[PDB]
Design a protein around this ligand. Structure first.
Ligand SMILES: CCCc1ccccc1
Length: 164
């Protein structure tokens, strides 16, 4: 398992514009297009992102290119953030994937506010971190995905993903 496989499981792959769990226009492997309720605005964002007139549909290659960019952006967001970088650098490789997954889903500023969990992770208090992480809108709104990511932080293994 690696971060691409993990997020491909969590986000799926859809080649036509769809609405994500929050009702926002998205495409590909969880590439958010816009939070605007306008499908036309989403199509404009899509065309800008891909560099051609897509009329709301892309190829698998194009989806994977956006996904490479989005993973890259999540990692860079972590490395540029003074609250996230030290915790990330303290983690092992599997747990770094759980970190990237959260930043991919919620964005860097969002995650950077998880202050108590960040501290417990930096301290390697894994069961405590897991308990704290579940006390969140995130866990309540996407509990199956949150449980996988939390298990990944708790154990430092891919046990929650290997069956998938
Ligand atoms: C709950 C914070 C998880 C995290 C995210 C980004 C970098 C390190 C740890």
């Amino acid at each position: 398992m690696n971060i691409f496989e993990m997020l491909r499981i969590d986000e799926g792959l859809r080649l036509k514009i769809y609405k994500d769990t929050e009702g926002y226009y998205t495409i590909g492997i969880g590439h958010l297009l816009t939070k605007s309720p306008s499908l036309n605005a989403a199509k404009s964002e899509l065309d800008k992102a891909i560099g051609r007139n897509c009329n709301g549909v892309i190829t698998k290659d194009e989806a994977e290119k956006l996904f490479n960019q989005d993973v890259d952006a999540a990692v860079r967001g972590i490395l540029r953030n003074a609250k996230l970088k030290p915790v990330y650098d303290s983690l092992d490789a599997v747990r770094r994937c759980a970190a990237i997954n959260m930043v991919f889903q919620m964005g860097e500023t969002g995650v950077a506010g998880f202050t108590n969990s960040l501290r417990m992770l930096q301290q390697k208090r894994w069961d405590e971190a897991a308990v704290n992480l579940a006390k969140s809108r995130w866990y309540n709104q996407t509990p199956n995905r949150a449980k996988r990511v939390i298990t990944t932080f708790r154990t430092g293994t891919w046990d929650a993903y290997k069956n998938l």
